[PDB]
Amino acid sequence: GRVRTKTVKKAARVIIEKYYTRLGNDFHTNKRVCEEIAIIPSKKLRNKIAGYVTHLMKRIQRGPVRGISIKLQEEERERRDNYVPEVSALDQEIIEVDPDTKEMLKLLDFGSLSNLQVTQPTVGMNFKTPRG
Amino acid sequence: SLGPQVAEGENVFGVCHIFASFNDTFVHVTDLSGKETICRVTGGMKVKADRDESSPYAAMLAAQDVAQRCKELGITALHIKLRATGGNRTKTPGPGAQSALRALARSGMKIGRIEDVTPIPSDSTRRKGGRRGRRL
Amino acid sequence: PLAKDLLHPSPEEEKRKHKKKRLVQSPNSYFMDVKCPGCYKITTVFSHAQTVVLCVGCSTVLCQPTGGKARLTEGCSFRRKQH
Amino acid sequence: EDVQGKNCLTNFHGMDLTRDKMCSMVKKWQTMIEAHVDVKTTDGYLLRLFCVGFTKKRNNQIRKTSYAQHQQVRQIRKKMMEIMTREVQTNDLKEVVNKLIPDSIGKDIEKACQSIYPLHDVFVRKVKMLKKPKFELGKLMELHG
Amino acid sequence: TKKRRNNGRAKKGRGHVQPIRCTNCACCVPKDKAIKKFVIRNIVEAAAVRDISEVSVFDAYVLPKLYVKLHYCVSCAIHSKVVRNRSREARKDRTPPPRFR
RNA sequence: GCAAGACUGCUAGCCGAGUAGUGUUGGGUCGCGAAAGGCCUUGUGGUACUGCCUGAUAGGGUGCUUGCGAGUGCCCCGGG
RNA sequence: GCGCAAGACGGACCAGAGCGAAAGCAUUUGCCAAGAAUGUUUUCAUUAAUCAAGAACGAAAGUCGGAGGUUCGAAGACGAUCAGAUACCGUCGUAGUUCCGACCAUAAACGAUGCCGACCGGCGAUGCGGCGGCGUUAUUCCCAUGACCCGCCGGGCAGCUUCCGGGAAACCAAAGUCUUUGGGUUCCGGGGGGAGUAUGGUUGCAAAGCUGAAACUUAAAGGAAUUUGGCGAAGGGCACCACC
Ligand SMILES: [Zn+2]
């Protein structure tokens, strides 16, 4: 079989993490890049490294990868978790309040609120899976 | 074999009892009463060595022979009465019951109701063997 | 937990516990009254009657013996009394 | 019983149940009630009826035991005996085997045992005869129409 | 030493139960100790059902099932490979083996 | 005697009429339940659905589709 | 396939469910007697706990005398297996297995863990009795009863979890509250073998049961756990110095 070694995989992962804008999907081109920007003591090791780099490009061009962090692929996560919507999902016109917690809230600090309503309780009390 | 019947209007129904054990198969065919039989062919009549009596091939050969004799006589449909050794010995049927039933199905007959008549007891009689059973 | 006010707890815990495991043991039973529409008399019976009780004048039956509290006859009103 | 010519006129001899349902109705975590009676019809025919009843698990039930007390089983069996005794003593053979084609006896058993404990599968497992009287040609002829 | 929390059986306050017999053997084993197996089987196996339904006169004929209960002595059970030995840490798993098909 | 409130049952013109019949496990003040005949305002509007049986569009069983898990379809009268 | 006759047993339902001091107890129904738990604002007032002497019960096997003996089956008779096989296996088969009456008091009679009583964490459940509550059903209204659901109390068979704690550890909510050593009380062990042996006593028709030494010999015999080890142990892979 053809299973890559920790040395080849580690070198390919770190050469993707350091360099990303100087590579591609063509095997011979980024083989020449990997020859130029690194020191590799053999031709066969260089070809194996460039092959795993091409496989890493084919993995990366689909979606996110859980082992490699790329600065061009970074800033997207904080782009998605920085912006906010106009509705805060906490200030509505109706709040689903049970009569039991309504009576609890009346005992707490209040007699009436401007945004609460009372629903009806269920007719049957079943809440657990049948196991005996 | 003969009578005023017609082969197109109706079909002749019989009842076949399949005794399957772990030593031999009894492919028996009776009438609708069950009192009087047509032909009784057993799995030992085909093979010569008794080790092949529990083989499915002997049950297939016996079932094919009794089925060709019965459809030569004029019985077309069969009701299945599968029965194991029974009693206190063994509830599981033998290895030749499936092969015998498939050979009856492929011979050109017809199959009606299927039921099992293994004689399960109401915990009656002490089993064969001692307290420690068979040692091997 | 570790800190429990065993001097005076909430009365739910005394009403929930056994009749002998409280700080001061007290029965959970009470004395009760029976009034019928048919007979114009009032009799005082125990909650756990454990016997057949007849009203004064032999008008109607009033109680039925059970394992626990008695089965009052249907149509009879009651209220708890204390001194 | 007799042949006139080329015809075998038949008569009732017993009722059985198939073994498949007999070992398919029995399940774990449920109980059984069985009753057997020696009742005789309004003619000279004596029957012997066997019955079996099982346990209904409710729809909103979380418990997997579904057992019952012993006195409830005795009361259910007593209801079974008085139902089976009451329903056949006023009738003859034709009416009881006409009733045997549906499960009206089983329906009355499972409807009588409703306030005691629910039952979900009630069937008459077996019918046997013990006493055979003198054969009558006219009764068998009227039994065939 | 003490191998199990119980004694390999299911009696806690009894002292004596009625004995039963093995199926492969004839060994007398107590009822709560023997490894029961209520197997659910039918008449034909996988591929004869098409031939049976082709030869069956009644259309949409439902097939019957065979219900037997099998009782095994533990030596005959292990020799038949229905139960296997487990590790010391994973012995305390009373959950049944998972069924899929 | 004063004074209005919160909740609920039946009916969809009303009186006949909750009278028989049926009904169960134990009862009750007991469920289910239509006319004969008469007087009128001469019959209040909206809204989805309906596999078969028992005992309601409820309750409890149990089906058909392609083998399973899940959709959809299955009161009747008609037309295309 | 239809019937008859005899004896034995009570399958599926049957579960880490119930009762009983223990040995043990499973077809429906009838009769007699007893008992735990629960309920009580009933009754007496310390009647209580453990126990030499003594007493009752006590699986199977074994003995005596009957009736009966279906199946199974010591001893025995053979056939194979094997170098030997009076063993595993297969076919017959006497006592015995079943019931009554009279014996003996032996088990891994084991939870290998004396009885009573106080304290010391949590959680999901199970069986019983009692208490309280939204709802569905025994066809539609009410109440009580049964059947579900939600919780509580008391006794019990258990289960999961925990760095309470203990132990040599396996493990135990008791085997904890133990050097910071004392709640009450009965029996019982001082390295291994000789030896549960010999004599004596007692009991028994008999077999045997209880009580129970000594000379001599020995430097270890053991309990828990760890690591390659070997399995005619199981689960996955490999090799023409293995096979097909
Ligand atoms: Zn075995």
PDB file of C-alpha atoms (C1' of nucleotides) in Angstrom, chain G residues 33-142:
ATOM      1  C1'   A G  33     -55.668 -23.254  61.033  1.00  0.00           C
ATOM      2  C1'   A G  34     -51.660 -19.679  61.349  1.00  0.00           C
ATOM      3  C1'   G G  35     -48.593 -15.376  60.110  1.00  0.00           C
ATOM      4  C1'   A G  36     -45.553 -10.534  58.469  1.00  0.00           C
ATOM      5  C1'   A G  37     -46.578  -5.538  56.932  1.00  0.00           C
ATOM      6  C1'   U G  38     -50.050  -1.479  56.955  1.00  0.00           C
ATOM      7  C1'   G G  39     -54.277   1.678  59.950  1.00  0.00           C
ATOM      8  C1'   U G  40     -55.531   3.226  65.008  1.00  0.00           C
ATOM      9  C1'   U G  41     -56.178  10.022  69.948  1.00  0.00           C
ATOM     10  C1'   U G  42     -58.026   1.068  71.612  1.00  0.00           C
ATOM     11  C1'   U G  43     -56.006  -2.245  75.690  1.00  0.00           C
ATOM     12  C1'   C G  44     -51.671  -4.039  80.026  1.00  0.00           C
ATOM     13  C1'   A G  45     -47.531  -1.410  82.082  1.00  0.00           C
ATOM     14  C1'   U G  46     -41.492  -3.122  81.442  1.00  0.00           C
ATOM     15  C1'   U G  47     -44.162  -8.408  80.446  1.00  0.00           C
ATOM     16  C1'   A G  48     -37.362  -7.142  77.116  1.00  0.00           C
ATOM     17  C1'   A G  49     -32.347  -9.043  74.164  1.00  0.00           C
ATOM     18  C1'   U G  50     -28.933 -13.164  73.608  1.00  0.00           C
ATOM     19  C1'   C G  51     -28.790 -18.009  75.302  1.00  0.00           C
ATOM     20  C1'   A G  52     -25.478 -24.301  79.192  1.00  0.00           C
ATOM     21  C1'   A G  53     -29.306 -28.455  80.204  1.00  0.00           C
ATOM     22  C1'   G G  54     -33.364 -29.758  77.136  1.00  0.00           C
ATOM     23  C1'   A G  55     -37.101 -29.602  72.798  1.00  0.00           C
ATOM     24  C1'   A G  56     -39.468 -29.123  67.350  1.00  0.00           C
ATOM     25  C1'   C G  57     -38.470 -29.100  62.050  1.00  0.00           C
ATOM     26  C1'   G G  58     -34.716 -30.613  58.791  1.00  0.00           C
ATOM     27  C1'   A G  59     -32.816 -31.724  50.762  1.00  0.00           C
ATOM     28  C1'   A G  60     -31.088 -36.056  48.384  1.00  0.00           C
ATOM     29  C1'   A G  61     -28.960 -40.745  49.360  1.00  0.00           C
ATOM     30  C1'   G G  62     -29.482 -45.187  53.015  1.00  0.00           C
ATOM     31  C1'   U G  63     -32.798 -49.298  56.310  1.00  0.00           C
ATOM     32  C1'   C G  64     -37.183 -52.006  57.849  1.00  0.00           C
ATOM     33  C1'   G G  65     -43.088 -53.456  56.395  1.00  0.00           C
ATOM     34  C1'   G G  66     -46.858 -52.770  52.783  1.00  0.00           C
ATOM     35  C1'   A G  67     -49.546 -51.230  47.899  1.00  0.00           C
ATOM     36  C1'   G G  68     -47.603 -49.782  43.122  1.00  0.00           C
ATOM     37  C1'   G G  69     -43.946 -49.698  39.399  1.00  0.00           C
ATOM     38  C1'   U G  70     -44.818 -45.016  32.994  1.00  0.00           C
ATOM     39  C1'   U G  71     -40.033 -42.945  32.219  1.00  0.00           C
ATOM     40  C1'   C G  72     -35.164 -42.576  34.084  1.00  0.00           C
ATOM     41  C1'   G G  73     -31.553 -45.589  36.285  1.00  0.00           C
ATOM     42  C1'   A G  74     -26.384 -47.494  40.878  1.00  0.00           C
ATOM     43  C1'   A G  75     -24.720 -53.036  40.517  1.00  0.00           C
ATOM     44  C1'   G G  76     -24.850 -56.318  36.248  1.00  0.00           C
ATOM     45  C1'   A G  77     -25.026 -58.200  30.635  1.00  0.00           C
ATOM     46  C1'   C G  78     -23.076 -56.813  25.925  1.00  0.00           C
ATOM     47  C1'   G G  79     -21.225 -53.471  21.014  1.00  0.00           C
ATOM     48  C1'   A G  80     -17.582 -50.129  19.687  1.00  0.00           C
ATOM     49  C1'   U G  81     -13.470 -46.765  21.297  1.00  0.00           C
ATOM     50  C1'   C G  82      -8.241 -47.791  23.022  1.00  0.00           C
ATOM     51  C1'   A G  83      -1.696 -50.531  23.546  1.00  0.00           C
ATOM     52  C1'   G G  84      -4.840 -51.489  28.063  1.00  0.00           C
ATOM     53  C1'   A G  85     -10.935 -48.893  28.961  1.00  0.00           C
ATOM     54  C1'   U G  86     -14.655 -53.649  33.720  1.00  0.00           C
ATOM     55  C1'   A G  87     -14.096 -45.077  31.642  1.00  0.00           C
ATOM     56  C1'   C G  88     -16.467 -40.837  28.097  1.00  0.00           C
ATOM     57  C1'   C G  89     -20.437 -43.283  24.111  1.00  0.00           C
ATOM     58  C1'   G G  90     -24.714 -46.743  22.500  1.00  0.00           C
ATOM     59  C1'   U G  91     -28.742 -50.920  23.782  1.00  0.00           C
ATOM     60  C1'   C G  92     -31.118 -53.687  27.774  1.00  0.00           C
ATOM     61  C1'   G G  93     -31.601 -53.744  32.961  1.00  0.00           C
ATOM     62  C1'   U G  94     -32.167 -55.487  39.402  1.00  0.00           C
ATOM     63  C1'   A G  95     -32.448 -51.973  43.980  1.00  0.00           C
ATOM     64  C1'   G G  96     -34.031 -46.954  43.885  1.00  0.00           C
ATOM     65  C1'   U G  97     -36.979 -42.839  41.860  1.00  0.00           C
ATOM     66  C1'   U G  98     -43.789 -42.365  43.550  1.00  0.00           C
ATOM     67  C1'   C G  99     -47.447 -42.977  48.357  1.00  0.00           C
ATOM     68  C1'   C G 100     -48.101 -44.542  53.544  1.00  0.00           C
ATOM     69  C1'   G G 101     -45.969 -46.055  58.716  1.00  0.00           C
ATOM     70  C1'   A G 102     -41.283 -46.558  61.733  1.00  0.00           C
ATOM     71  C1'   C G 103     -35.774 -44.805  61.680  1.00  0.00           C
ATOM     72  C1'   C G 104     -30.408 -41.557  61.006  1.00  0.00           C
ATOM     73  C1'   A G 105     -29.545 -36.268  61.485  1.00  0.00           C
ATOM     74  C1'   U G 106     -25.789 -35.720  57.258  1.00  0.00           C
ATOM     75  C1'   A G 107     -24.638 -31.111  52.361  1.00  0.00           C
ATOM     76  C1'   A G 108     -20.384 -25.875  48.688  1.00  0.00           C
ATOM     77  C1'   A G 109     -27.429 -27.061  54.649  1.00  0.00           C
ATOM     78  C1'   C G 110     -23.043 -21.014  51.343  1.00  0.00           C
ATOM     79  C1'   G G 111     -25.034 -14.505  51.641  1.00  0.00           C
ATOM     80  C1'   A G 112     -18.323 -19.384  52.402  1.00  0.00           C
ATOM     81  C1'   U G 113     -20.732 -13.024  56.024  1.00  0.00           C
ATOM     82  C1'   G G 114     -24.564 -14.858  64.281  1.00  0.00           C
ATOM     83  C1'   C G 115     -29.007 -12.051  66.789  1.00  0.00           C
ATOM     84  C1'   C G 116     -31.030  -7.196  68.844  1.00  0.00           C
ATOM     85  C1'   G G 117     -30.404  -1.781  68.768  1.00  0.00           C
ATOM     86  C1'   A G 118     -28.511   3.734  67.499  1.00  0.00           C
ATOM     87  C1'   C G 119     -26.022   6.839  63.865  1.00  0.00           C
ATOM     88  C1'   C G 120     -23.894   7.637  59.051  1.00  0.00           C
ATOM     89  C1'   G G 121     -24.832  10.442  51.453  1.00  0.00           C
ATOM     90  C1'   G G 122     -27.448  10.442  46.665  1.00  0.00           C
ATOM     91  C1'   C G 123     -30.652   8.260  42.496  1.00  0.00           C
ATOM     92  C1'   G G 124     -33.870   5.373  39.354  1.00  0.00           C
ATOM     93  C1'   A G 125     -37.085   1.364  40.164  1.00  0.00           C
ATOM     94  C1'   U G 126     -39.911  -3.252  42.253  1.00  0.00           C
ATOM     95  C1'   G G 127     -43.802  -6.050  45.814  1.00  0.00           C
ATOM     96  C1'   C G 128     -47.375  -4.926  49.807  1.00  0.00           C
ATOM     97  C1'   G G 129     -50.636  -1.614  52.937  1.00  0.00           C
ATOM     98  C1'   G G 130     -52.237   3.404  53.781  1.00  0.00           C
ATOM     99  C1'   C G 131     -52.742   8.933  52.385  1.00  0.00           C
ATOM    100  C1'   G G 132     -53.297  13.130  48.616  1.00  0.00           C
ATOM    101  C1'   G G 133     -54.019  14.942  43.584  1.00  0.00           C
ATOM    102  C1'   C G 134     -54.696  17.494  36.880  1.00  0.00           C
ATOM    103  C1'   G G 135     -56.580  13.875  33.613  1.00  0.00           C
ATOM    104  C1'   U G 136     -58.469   8.757  30.243  1.00  0.00           C
ATOM    105  C1'   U G 137     -61.376   3.997  30.779  1.00  0.00           C
ATOM    106  C1'   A G 138     -65.611   0.242  33.097  1.00  0.00           C
ATOM    107  C1'   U G 139     -69.154   4.338  26.631  1.00  0.00           C
ATOM    108  C1'   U G 140     -70.862  10.342  27.949  1.00  0.00           C
ATOM    109  C1'   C G 141     -74.172  13.291  34.993  1.00  0.00           C
ATOM    110  C1'   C G 142     -72.463  12.424  40.252  1.00  0.00           C
TER     111        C G 142
END
